Design a protein around this ligand. Structure first.
Ligand SMILES: *[C@@H]1O[C@H](CO)[C@@H](O[C@@H]2O[C@H](CO)[C@@H](O)[C@H](O)[C@H]2NC(C)=O)[C@H](O)[C@H]1NC(C)=O
Ligand SMILES: *[C@@H]1O[C@H](CO)[C@@H](O[C@@H]2O[C@H](CO)[C@@H](O)[C@H](O)[C@H]2NC(C)=O)[C@H](O)[C@H]1NC(C)=O
Ligand SMILES: *[C@@H]1O[C@H](CO)[C@@H](O[C@@H]2O[C@H](CO)[C@@H](O)[C@H](O)[C@H]2NC(C)=O)[C@H](O)[C@H]1NC(C)=O
Ligand SMILES: *[C@@H]1O[C@H](CO)[C@@H](O)[C@H](O)[C@H]1NC(C)=O
Ligand SMILES: *[C@@H]1O[C@H](CO)[C@@H](O)[C@H](O)[C@H]1NC(C)=O
Ligand SMILES: *[C@@H]1O[C@H](CO)[C@@H](O)[C@H](O)[C@H]1NC(C)=O
Ligand SMILES: *[C@@H]1O[C@H](CO)[C@@H](O)[C@H](O)[C@H]1NC(C)=O
Ligand SMILES: *[C@@H]1O[C@H](CO)[C@@H](O)[C@H](O)[C@H]1NC(C)=O
Ligand SMILES: *[C@@H]1O[C@H](CO)[C@@H](O)[C@H](O)[C@H]1NC(C)=O
Lengths: 322, 155, 155, 155, 322, 322
């Protein structure tokens, strides 16, 4: 007798999927939704190549530390990498006010180049000061490239003042500092005035500073201590300096332009010659899968982060042996 | 399954059927897949897969922020946001896959049941349902049943 | 569809049927909607619509905050919260509509199949299923089939 | 329901049936629950309940922070995070229960329909479907129908 | 032969819905869930009418800028609107400390009315000072209405002091400032003392201020500069002022009461005579729909924001032609 | 005639569940997902017992208020509880800078014990000062136990200085303060110097402070006022003090170790002898249910918070009477 029958597929697939009602259900076809791997390498994005730092920290590159003379010509980047180790930043002992903000602002911008703000040739005080705390690469007593240490000239320190106006059609970031001598002699030897008034003023900010003579614990073989500061001069605005001692005056400022990825990654990954869509602190990635399990913190077009190692979606039907 | 066709009244599948999911196996004087139901099923499982990928496709760049020793609270507030959004997505991603897997298995179960019904409906009084997905009754007549052109009035 | 009634064995719908969704069309010596199944369907699609509106009905007032040039981080932290919560709701709103649309179409598909089955069950041996949602067999007898009072023992 | 068995063609349930959900009640010369379908149903409703408890099982410790009179913004930013995450979970928790309740009731509806079908399929021509979940035809023969061993060729 | 058949509805509806498995499925009945439109108008809420500002900013209305004399009588509001243009706030060059907080606090409260704290009739110094920087509407040299500029009287400036206690059963917001002369002559002409000590103290706060003589870049034709401050005096508390020069002393404070919507909107929308349930920066809205796509930032009872322009829910069944 | 029938269960259960399509559907078996109750008691966790405070606040226990002599021996805790009432903290009128951070840091750590930093036996000034503002339990004029009030000795106050280095292999938290006399006589009677320079310096921080003579409103029958400060000394670091008057110098610091739950609860709950998995400000809880409706703020392993009072999941089928 002639017969006809309806039936379904089965194969030697060992792939299982979970449902809400049952665990590990055999199926014919499956799709993995989670990319599990990474390539542990630093690649460039569509904005360009990153700025890798293994010798100098970012706050040292801004202040112009004398061991960071490589970066005086200026750099542009897609993102910034810092090696997680002992990096050369602030040479002379002291704290930077709003340090986390300064690093955030400077990483946000694409390009920076140096610009001379103040000419110390006309100034009637000595500006050639150096320190053993701020050694150059040859271990010679030097100082910051972007700021000058103002001391007395011919046994006097008169009230100095000078102006600089921004007409570059772009913002400028500049830094200064207040030196606090340890002893009374240092104050009279360096600046000659027991009490001094220093101030930095623009069209928006109005800031004044006083020293206070008193020794500190040794940090880098120095009984003294500094208080570092920074500001932003907008296009058309005017900055004006005024002191009679106790200022590390700005000589150079940083002309900043464009937008970066606004990121400082912290890894020991090797810099490779490659272009990428997605970049992580853990590595690089290119996949069609909707999910990934390496990190939630990424830059560029990347899959969604979930902590699961594997998620299987059923495409085919239940795998039923005959 | 809900529709009780796959691993139900049709106990086992056919390893000989490689061309598609659902198919016909006859026995006359003298195995193949139905291209209507199987193609319509593949369309649904390509559009479903794409929609799952599309719903998760939107990206936001979660920056790492630096905080001082006196900024303990705003550091804790920032870590809460990142830890609590990831939990909601981890839930959604995991839950959506468990819900759609159950529906997919039951959708395949219904496709077989419908293909068994539409063959029973075209044959009418001529055949008898064995109750294991079979129908006791030319290669043309078997071919006219496959593409759904069989005229029961002829026999 | 899953239940294989709508655009299945009943290939086409009736443009003459305006009163409701599901209905009866006979042909005797001498078209109308079944009020039991259609009213029970309308109840389910008014309660569903209301529940969707209710689940989204809760409001929170998202204020705009002002931040200085030195408050870059807490400004970025605030923008993350707003951008990441909106993504979760945009996902939920979009996903819920795709899930309930599929169920609604399949619920309507089941309502026809059930209405076809309960008529086949009351008529018993007297009629024969054509296989296109029809049954070859008075206006009272046709009316007794509609409201489900037909006694097969009489005929 | 979708499958139209529970409160459908089988109008009422049996208060005499205490041992399980689905069961058999016969009437011969001389009530009990089917252990195959009922045990497989209990497995699905223990694994479902556990998965619902598991998806919500992940904890995060939401600290209370203190803010000064000049810290109004970061206080408002913190309260927004807590109020907006709780709304998403309140939605998810409420919505998941409404979705799975509907599926559970329809899953039970399908289990009865499948148990009614597999008995109709084994009996074949010998019995006649009354249309109220009954089949007009020894205690061994009634017992062979229960465990699905009945040979219709014998009768 | 008599026959009976079961069938379903179809109509000439061109409405389609999306599912997870299929795109653009024809259906009989649909419901739109997204309200797409707005009425670009400013309406009042259940708390009352808003305070629209097109001439004066909020920090100028607090300081009592002499071009903002319209608002001396006092105002109450549901919410505040500021026109996005050049608004008259602080007339004399300088910064407000915690400006974002002050504006936030002042917008949070419903009603404000002025109260005289300090009587300068008994004070033994001149308080009638004016400036070309702070011109009135007639372009006459005037000053802030809520603060007084204290200068020397009969060629002397003795150490002044006075007390005020809050017994109004409500908080008071008051502002002061420290003037920083450009030259040494200005310090000796105005106040007569080369170095001065000013301080503002309550039961909770203890604040002291020093001037520092040094010229600034011109802002509004003024070489000088001020540093503005504010505080909140609770019911029962006592504020006490003390100086020997270099203070813009408070004459009036702001008695604040109730809760507003706590909002400053920034739009050029026309103020209309209407009551509303929901108000946006983009306009007004009244709908039954659960969703809206104009803004996430709203005030009052409003639908949920999603970026989708249209979401269609299936009510009816699949539309199948015969 | 012999017949066989298939049927389903029904029982006298009055339990109903909601679906998306229907309200209050009768069912056979249900599971409650929301635990509604709490036991209003304070229990200890796996880290140990908490530190309950009903007499002294946390900032008073740090400063060493003379009415808080019970806690000089030192304490460790799992979490901290503060009674919501009038608590004894800062005795002498004044504000603590970064108070919210200090309380946050101190609650974060598990254990604290006192350590003597500075020996005032060798110092050439009187350190035995007391005040009626800082009464002990016997209402005798006393002072803080962790800080000393430095006044003149034999009608003079020379420039004092001393050093302390941390070699305990753990962080130390210490507090100081600057006293601001009301009148000119008080400055010359107590310290003898009209103007004084005080400063506190470490390897990381550099801080200096000046007094300013001017009377304040009475707070605790005292015309004077103090400005309280704090810092953290890391292992190996050195703190050095220097003044010529106007300092409340540190005598003792707090040696801190481990991690707590980092929590200060605010309740009037009774302390019970019990161990718990989950602890709330509202009480204690042990349940198998996935949800709870008492608070979102909890410590330890606890169910998820939703505002719903009851959520019912269908386990059984629809309850249909015969
Ligand atoms: C992300 O998930 C992956 C995949 O489960 C894990 O990485 C490894 O993946 C390879 C296959 O590519 C497996 O053979 C290894 O066994 C996996 N590792 C382990 C430890 O099992 C990995 O666990 C996850 N990655 C991260 C960074 O968490
Ligand atoms: C919100 O969505 C609406 C609706 O899609 C968009 O506004 C317009 O709506 C009208 C109908 O009321 C259409 O005729 C227009 O074509 C729509 N505009 C456009 C550009 O297509 C609008 O895109 C959305 N509104 C906002 C502010 O994003
Ligand atoms: C949490 O929900 C519970 C349960 O609905 C509420 O507390 C009480 O619970 C008991 C049963 O244990 C009922 O008899 C009471 O009627 C409930 N109280 C009320 C006011 O109805 C309680 O409303 C919720 N708890 C909190 C703190 O919100
Ligand atoms: C700087 O160089 C000098 C000798 O040139 C050396 O004595 C000193 O230790 C160096 N400083 C540092 C910080 O290494
Ligand atoms: C000193 O320098 C200033 C500018 O800083 C200048 O104006 C002045 O002429 C100089 N002194 C002399 C004596 O030239
Ligand atoms: C104030 O008015 C005077 C003349 O009365 C004018 O010279 C000056 O420019 C005005 N100030 C401003 C800022 O417009
Ligand atoms: C100067 O004013 C003070 C109050 O500020 C007052 O006490 C004093 O009597 C006045 N001087 C004279 C000489 O009256
Ligand atoms: C301190 O005690 C003295 C008497 O010994 C008393 O006069 C004074 O009021 C007390 N201080 C406080 C704040 O109670
Ligand atoms: C005063 O105290 C200092 C340390 O603070 C000490 O060095 C000095 O010897 C003391 N004075 C005298 C006269 O001994």
């Amino acid at each position: 007798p002639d017969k006809i029958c309806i039936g379904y597929q089965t194969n030697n697939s060992t792939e299982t999927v979970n449902t809400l009602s049952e665990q590990n259900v055999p199926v014919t076809q499956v799709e993995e939704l989670v990319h599990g791997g990474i390539d542990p390498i630093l690649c460039g994005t569509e904005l360009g190549s990153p700025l890798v730092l293994d010798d100098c920290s970012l706050e040292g590159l801004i202040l112009g530390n004398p061991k960071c003379d490589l970066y005086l010509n200026g750099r542009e980047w897609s993102y910034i990498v810092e090696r997680p180790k002992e990096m050369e930043g602030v040479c002379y002992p002291g704290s930077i006010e709003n340090q986390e903000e300064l690093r955030s602002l400077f990483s946000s911008i694409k390009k920076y180049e140096r610009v001379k703000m103040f000419d110390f040739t006309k100034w009637n005080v000595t500006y050639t000061g150096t320190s053993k705390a701020c050694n150059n690469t040859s271990n010679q007593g030097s100082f910051y490239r972007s700021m000058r240490w103002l001391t007395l000239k011919s046994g006097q320190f008169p009230v100095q003042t000078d102006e600089y106006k921004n007409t570059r059609d772009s913002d400028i970031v500049f830094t200064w500092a207040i030196h606090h001598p340890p002893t009374s002699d240092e104050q009279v030897k360096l600046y000659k005035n027991p009490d001094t008034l220093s101030s930095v003023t623009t069209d928006e900010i109005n800031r004044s500073f006083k020293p206070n003579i008193g020794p500190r614990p040794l940090v880098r073989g120095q009984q003294g201590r500094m208080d570092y500061y920074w500001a932003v001069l907008k296009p058309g605005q005017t900055v004006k300096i005024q002191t009679n001692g106790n200022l590390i005056a700005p000589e150079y400022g940083h002309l900043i332009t464009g937008k970066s990825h606004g990121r400082i990654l912290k890894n020991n990954l090797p810099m490779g010659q490659c272009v990428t869509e997605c970049q992580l602190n853990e590595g690089v990635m290119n996949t069609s899968k909707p999910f990934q399990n390496t990190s939630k913190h990424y830059i560029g077009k990347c899959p969604k982060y979930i902590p699961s190692g594997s998620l299987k979606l059923a495409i085919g039907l239940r795998n039923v042996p005959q | 399954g809900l529709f009780g066709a796959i691993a139900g009244f049709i106990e086992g599948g056919w390893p000989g059927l490689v061309a598609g999911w659902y198919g016909f196996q006859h026995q006359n004087a003298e195995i193949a897949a139905d291209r209507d139901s199987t193609q319509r099923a593949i369309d649904n499982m390509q559009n479903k897969l794409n929609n799952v990928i599309d719903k998760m496709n939107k990206q936001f760049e979660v920056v790492n922020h630096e905080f001082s020793e006196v900024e303990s609270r705003i550091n804790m507030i920032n870590s809460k946001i990142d830890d609590q959004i990831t939990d909601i997505w981890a839930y959604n991603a995991e839950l959506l896959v468990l819900l759609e897997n159950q529906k997919t298995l039951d959708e395949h179960d219904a496709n077989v049941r419908n293909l068994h019904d539409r063959v029973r409906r075209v044959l009418r009084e001529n055949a008898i349902d064995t109750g294991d997905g079979c129908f006791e009754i030319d290669n043309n007549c078997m071919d006219t049943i496959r593409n759904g052109t069989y005229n029961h009035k002829e026999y």
